[PDB]
Design a protein around this ligand. Structure first.
Ligand SMILES: [Pt+2]
Lengths: 166, 163
C-alpha cells in the first residue's frame, strides 16, 4: 500500500531547495526498467540497477485513477537478461524501456525519490507506505508545500504512459 | 541445451550401486516445485530449496518427442512466496506442487540427480548440457548401462504428468 504523488521539477533548483532542509540520503540507483504489456490496472517490470549489480521483478496493481495508490509485490532476481527472456518466451510484449537515475532521501515517515528520467525530465516522487491513503496524502502535501511545490507541478501520468506518449 | 533421461529406481539400492563407482558429491536438496499451467512444449516453475535457503524460477522448453531434450532458462529469486503471488496475479494457474529430496553427483562427465519424489516414487535423472543430442544421449546410456539401468526402467513422463 504505497501512496505517492509525483511532481515535475528542475533538478538543479530543487536540489538547492532540498539541501536547505538537508534530509537524510538513503541511496542512489541507475535504473533500467523494462515494462511488459499487461491489462490495466496491472504493472509488470524487470528493473536492473547497474551501479549496485541488483535486479528486481516488480508487479503492481494501480488502485486509483490518480496513479497515487499502488499495491506492489517485488523481489530480487539474479539475472536481468534471463528474466526478460523468460517473459518474452512466455508471450509478454515489451511495452517500454525506461532509464533513470534516482536519489532516495528520507524524512520522518516520508520518502523523497528524486528522478532524472532519460528523454522525459526530472521529477520528485513523495511517497508514504500507509494503510490509510487520506492521512498519507496529507503528509505528502505538507512536505510538497514545504518544498514550494504546487498542484500545477503534479504529474498524474506514469513514466510508462509518458514514454509511450513521448 | 540439456539432454536428460529419467529412470525408475529403488533409492538405497541405486545409491549403493552408484557409490561403487566413486561419484563426485555436489549437494543435497529438499525441493518444492510449483508448476504453473503454460502451453506446450513449455514448463514454468518456481522452486524452493528449503535446506539451502535458495529459490529459483525455471523455464523450460521441450525440444524433442520423448521429453529428453530441453532448453532451460533459470535464475535465483529472493522470495518464493512472492514469486508465486506475482504469477497468480498475472493470471497463471498452479498445475501441481511437487516435493522431492535430491542427491546430486557428477560421474564420468554426466550429472546424476537421485530423487525421492513425494507421492510418486524414486528416480534418477542422468543429464548432460550440450549441443549434440545424439552423442549426449549415448554418453548417458553408457553410464546408465553401467549402473544397471535398462530400457524398462526409463520414465518418459514428467513428474507433472505423473500426478
Ligand atoms: Pt562406465
Amino acid at each position: 500500500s504505497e501512496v505517492e504523488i509525483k511532481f515535475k521539477i528542475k533538478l538543479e533548483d530543487f536540489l538547492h531547495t532540498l539541501n536547505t532542509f538537508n534530509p537524510e540520503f538513503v541511496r542512489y540507483e541507475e535504473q533500467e526498467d523494462v515494462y511488459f504489456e499487461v491489462p490495466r490496472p496491472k504493472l509488470l517490470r524487470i528493473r536492473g540497477v547497474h551501479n549496485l549489480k541488483k535486479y528486481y521483478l516488480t508487479f503492481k496493481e494501480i488502485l486509483d485513477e490518480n496513479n497515487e495508490e499502488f499495491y506492489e509485490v517485488e523481489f530480487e532476481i539474479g539475472d536481468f537478461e534471463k528474466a526478460v527472456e523468460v517473459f518474452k518466451r512466455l508471450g509478454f510484449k515489451i511495452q517500454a524501456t525506461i532509464k533513470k537515475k534516482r536519489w532516495v532521501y528520507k524524512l520522518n515517515g516520508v520518502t523523497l525519490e528524486v528522478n532524472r528520467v532519460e528523454g522525459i525530465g526530472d521529477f520528485v516522487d513523495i511517497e508514504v507506505i500507509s494503510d490509510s491513503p487520506e492521512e498519507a496524502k496529507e503528509k505528502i502535501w505538507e512536505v510538497a508545500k514545504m518544498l514550494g511545490l504546487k498542484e500545477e507541478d503534479v504529474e498524474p501520468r506514469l513514466y510508462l504512459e509518458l514514454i509511450n506518449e513521448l
